[PDB]
Amino acid sequence: MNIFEMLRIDEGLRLKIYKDTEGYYTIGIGHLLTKSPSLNAAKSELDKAIGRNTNGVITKDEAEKLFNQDVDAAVRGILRNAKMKPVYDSMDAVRRAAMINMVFQMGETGVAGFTNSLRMLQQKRWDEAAVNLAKSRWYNQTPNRAKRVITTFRTGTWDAYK
Ligand SMILES: [Cl-]
Ligand SMILES: [Cl-]
């Protein structure tokens, strides 16, 4: 298991524009296109991301390409963040993956606002952090995914994904 497989499990794969859990236009492996209610706006953002007139449909290879870029970008956002970097650096590889998953899903900003959970994770207080993480809109809205991520931080293994 690795970050890519983990996220491919949490996000799925769709080759046509779809709306995500929040109702936003997405495509591929959880690649958010736009928060705008306009499909055309979405189709526009898509062509620009792909570099061609897609008409709303993409290939498997294009999905994977976006996916790679997105994963890379999530890592970089972490490393570039003064609140997050230290937390991420303090953790083992499995737990790092859990953190990348969250940033991928909620963005850097979203994640940097889990201050208290971040402190606990840095302190290696696993059970506490797990409880704190669950007191969130995130957990209430996508509980099944949230539980997988939380178990991951709690145990340091990939068992939630086996
Ligand atoms: Cl892009
Ligand atoms: Cl879920």
Curated annotation (Swiss-Prot):
Keywords: Antimicrobial, Bacteriolytic enzyme, Cytolysis, Glycosidase, Host cell lysis by virus, Host cytoplasm, Hydrolase, Viral release from host cell. It catalyses: Hydrolysis of (1->4)-beta-linkages between N-acetylmuramic acid and N-acetyl-D-glucosamine residues in a peptidoglycan and between N-acetyl-D-glucosamine residues in chitodextrins. Optimum pH is 7.3. Changing G30A: Almost complete loss of enzymatic activity. Changing G30F: Almost complete loss of enzymatic activity. The enzyme is destabilized by 1.5 kcal/mol. One of its GO terms (molecular function) is lysozyme activity. This is Endolysin. The gene is E.
